[PDB]
């Protein structure tokens, strides 16, 4: 005999939770650059790195 | 020679000129052909550096 609001008390969390899910995983926290400098390792030999 | 600047060595010699005086100097060595054959590259490094 009770109403349809026996279902409203029903909870959700599932759906948001997928929500959150990551869509891409990240290596790095931001892409690596690809220049390689006519020089070579010449110009890391400038800052001793 | 080898100048060995910014701690990189090679053979070649590197001379610095100001803009003006590199025509007169090119009038100068017009008589030795040879010479200029063997100039390797010319490059315009700002003054700051």
């Known amino acids: 005999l009770s109403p349809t609001a026996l279902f409203s008390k029903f909870n959700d969390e599932y759906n948001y939770y997928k929500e959150l899910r990551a869509e891409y995983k990240d290596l790095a926290l931001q892409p690596p650059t690809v220049t390689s400098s006519q020089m070579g390792n010449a110009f890391q030999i400038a800052n001793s790195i | ?49």
């Open chain 2, 1 to 49: 020679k080898g100048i060995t600047y910014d701690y990189i060595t090679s053979p070649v010699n590197l001379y610095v000129m100001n803009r003006e005086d590199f025509n007169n100097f090119m009038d100068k060595m017009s008589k030795y052909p040879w010479i200029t054959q063997n100039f390797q590259k010319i490059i315009l490094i700002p003054a700051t550096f």
